[PDB]
C-alpha cells in the first residue's frame, strides 16, 4: 500500500503515464485512502498572518473589521490543518468550525491558497456552530 | 485592496449562514443551495426544492453503477452536501461512498449475496448499523443457549 | 495561485477516485498529472485517532463450548463498560455475563480499549459469554 503510494508519486514525477495508470488503478481496486498533496514550494510562501473574524448564530455582523485573532499559517495548509491549529490554540473541535473565505464555505481538503489566501492581513471568517 | 472585497464577500455569506442556523439549516445546506440555484432566499429553496434534487441524485447514482443496489436519501444528501451542491460530483461520491462500503462489508464477511446492499439502503449508508443487523443471525443461537442445563464452569483469568 | 489551482483540483480528484474505487477516473487524473510531471506527496492516510471508529475482530465463546467470530465497531478511547452496553443494546447479552479478555488478561469496566493495545482496524479481542446458570 505504502510502497504503491511512493511508486505512484515517483511515476507522476517521472513523466511515466502508463506506470501511473497501472499503480493508480491498483490502489483504486483496493479503495486505498490517500493524501495527495502538491509540493509546499509550489505555493505562495508563508507563514502569512491570517486575520480571523469569529462569529456565531447571534453575533451582530458589521463591516467594522476588528479581527479577534491573527494566526500565522502557511498558504499551502489545508483547511483541515487550520482547524487542527485552532483546536490546539483555542479548544473548538473541527466539528463546530466552518470556515468562510471570500465567497466560499471552505472544504477541509483544500488549501488556503486555493481560496486566495497569500498575503499578510488577509481576511477569513470562523463561524462556530452551537449544536453539533 | 482586494482584502476589502474578501471581507465584504465573507460577511455577505456569513450572514446567510447565520440566518440558516437559527432556522435549523447547516452551513453546508445553505451554501449548497446558493451554489446550485443562485437563490437569494436559501431557506425557501431548501424547503421547496431540495427533495427533488436528492431524488435525482439517487436515481442517477443507480444509473451510473446499477450493480450497487438502490441509494437512500440519506446517502444522496450526504454526497450533495459534501460536494457543496455540485450535481456531477455528488453523484460520483454517492456511488463511490456506497461502493467503498460494499467493499468493506465484503471483506468483513458480508457481500451482496448475504444482504449488504439491502442493509446499506435500510440504514441510510451507515456501515456500523448495517454490520450490526447482518450479524444478528450469528448471535441469536448464543442468545438462545444462555439458560441451558449444565453450562461449563466460570473460567478464572 | 497560478494554475497551481488546477494541479490541486486534479490531485484532490485523484484521491477521491482512488478512495471511491473509480478505476477509470483514477487512471485519468494520474495520467494528466504524470504527463505534467507534477511533483506530489502521496501517502496512505494514517490509521485513525483514538476518538474514531475502527472494526474490532471479536472471538466469542460461550459456556457451552460454542465459538464464533463477529465484528464490532468501536472507538479505542471507549471503556469496557461502554463496550458491554453496546453489546447489550445491540444483541441483548447483559453486561453481567460479558467477560472481556485481551492478552491473557481479564479487562475491567474502567479500562479503555486503547489501554489494552486495541488501536487500528483488524485488532482482536475475546468475549466470553457466561450462562445465566453460572453461579
Numbering used by the authors:
A (entry chain C): 169 to 300
B (entry chain B): 473 to 629
C (entry chain A): 2 to 136
Publication passage describing the model:
The linear ubiquitin chain assembly complex (LUBAC) participates in inflammatory and oncogenic signaling by conjugating linear ubiquitin chains to target proteins. LUBAC consists of the catalytic HOIP subunit and two accessory subunits, HOIL-1L and SHARPIN. In addition, linear ubiquitin chains linked via the N-terminal Met1 are generated by the linear ubiquitin chain assembly complex (LUBAC), which consists of the catalytic HOIP and the accessory HOIL-1L and SHARPIN subunits. Both SHARPIN and HOIL-1L interact with HOIP via their ubiquitin-like (UBL) domains, and the two interactions are thought to sufficiently stabilize LUBAC. We solved the co-crystal structure of the binding regions of the trimeric LUBAC complex and found that LUBAC-tethering motifs (LTMs) located N terminally to the UBL domains of HOIL-1L and SHARPIN heterodimerize and fold into a single globular domain.
Hence, we determined a crystal structure of mHOIP474–630 in ternary complex with mHOIL-1L1–140 and mSHARPIN163–341 at 2.4 Å resolution. As estimated via analytical size-exclusion chromatography, the core subunits assemble into a complex with 1:1:1 stoichiometry. In the ternary complex, mHOIP474–630 adopts an elongated configuration comprising seven a helices and two 310 helices and contains two UBA-like modules, the N-module (aa 474–536; UBA1) and the C-module (aa 559–617; UBA2), tandemly linked through a middle helix α4. The N-terminal μ1 helix in UBA1 and the C-terminal μ7 helix in UBA2 provide the major binding sites for the UBLs of SHARPIN and HOIL-1L, respectively; consequently, in the ternary complex, the two UBLs are independently arranged at opposite ends of the elongated mHOIP D-UBA. Furthermore, the crystal structure of the LUBAC ternary complex core has a new structural motif common to the pre-UBLs of mHOIL-1L and mSHARPIN (residues 5–45 of mHOIL-1L and 170–206 of mSHARPIN), which possess a unique helix-helix-strand structure that mediates stable heterodimerization. Intriguingly, the pair of LTMs folds into a single globular domain, referred to as the ‘‘tethering domain (TD)’’. The major heterodimeric interface in the TD is formed by the hydrophobic faces of the α1 and α2 helices from both LTMs and an intermolecular antiparallel β sheet consisting of the β1 strands (aa 41–45 of mHOIL-1L and 202–206 of mSHARPIN). In the TD, A31 of mHOIL-1L and A192 of mSHARPIN in the α2 helices make a direct van der Waals contact with each other. The TD and HOIP D-UBA undergo no significant interaction, except for a small contact site that could be attributed to crystal packing effects. Taken together, these findings suggest that tethering the UBLs of SHARPIN and HOIL-1L via their LTMs induces a more compact and rigid conformation of HOIP D-UBA than could be achieved by either UBL alone.
